[PDB]
Design a protein around this ligand. Structure first.
Ligand code: AR
Lengths: 21, 30
């Protein structure tokens, strides 16, 4: 989930926006 | 600011700024 994608690897706007409502 | 490793409240605050009025979900184990 978001921690794997943005904390343990480099985040991106695309991935953040996957978690917007 | 989004293109880095973001952990804990750092990640939460990025979500808050990017998602704006859409709001968001933070599930650090899922
Ligand atoms: Ar925040």
């Amino acid at each position: 989930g978001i921690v794997e994608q943005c904390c343990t690897s480099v985040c991106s706007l695309y991935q953040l926006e996957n978690y917007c409502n | 600011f989004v293109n880095q490793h973001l952990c804990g409240s750092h990640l939460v605050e990025a979500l808050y700024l990017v998602c704006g009025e859409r709001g968001f979900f933070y599930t650090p184990k899922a």
